[PDB]
Amino acid sequence: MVLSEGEWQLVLHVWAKVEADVAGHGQDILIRLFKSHPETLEKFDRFKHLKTEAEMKASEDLKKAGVTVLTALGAILKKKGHHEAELKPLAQSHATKHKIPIKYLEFISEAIIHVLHSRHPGNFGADAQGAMNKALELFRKDIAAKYKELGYQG
Numbered sequence: 001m002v003l004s005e006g007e008w009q010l011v012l013h014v015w016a017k018v019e020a021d022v023a024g025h026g027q028d029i030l031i032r033l034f035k036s037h038p039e040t041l042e043k044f045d046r047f048k049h050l051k052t053e054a055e056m057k058a059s060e061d062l063k064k065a066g067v068t069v070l071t072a073l074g075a076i077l078k079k080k081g082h083h084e085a086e087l088k089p090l091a092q093s094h095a096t097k098h099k100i101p102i103k104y105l106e107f108i109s110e111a112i113i114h115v116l117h118s119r120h121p122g123n124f125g126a127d128a129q130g131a132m133n134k135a136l137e138l139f140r141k142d143i144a145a146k147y148k149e150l151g152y153q154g
């Protein structure tokens with residue numbers, strides 16, 4: 001799949017807003033993920049013990065993890081499709097080391113869209129949400145293809 005320059009512009013315009021507060025968006029997104037799909041929390045030996053949202057919001061480790069996910073995702077989106085180099089180390093660690101199924105990437109995609117919609121209603125109308133969904137599907141499709149080459153595809 002290929003996004004048009006117009007769609008990339010919609011994605012990068014809302015992402016520029018996200019970058020004004022990377023730690024806050026990262027936290028919101030990971031908490032949204034863990035509450036919506038608690039099974040994903042088990043994949044993290046660092047957060048596994050966190051029982052409530054209050055505990056998640058107070059976790060300094062969780063806030064740092066959020067910055068890490070968003071920064072890597074941001075580097076990918078800014079490539080506007082030419083992200084093969086960035087995808088390789090990412091696909092290997094998630095497939096071989098952490099064993100994260102594609103299903104879980106759809107869950108986090110859903111959390112990202114939910115949070116952008118909550119925090120940026122003015123810059124995240126239907127067209128911009130369609131563009132972001134298209135960008136994340138591109139991401140998932142390429143990651144799934146690498147999973148298969150690495151011998152996992154989960």
Ligand code: HEM
Binds near residue numbers: 044046098
């Ligand atoms: C947009 C999505 C994602 C991005 C860009 C991303 C990025 C990263 C990065 C950059 C790291 C650091 C080093 C490494 O490669 O291991 C990492 C670690 C990890 N990721 Fe993700 N990840 C994503 C989604 C997920 C999902 C959905 C899960 C789990 C449900 C997950 C679980 C893990 C785990 C278990 C680790 C290591 C935690 C630790 O021991 O510090 N990731 N991820």
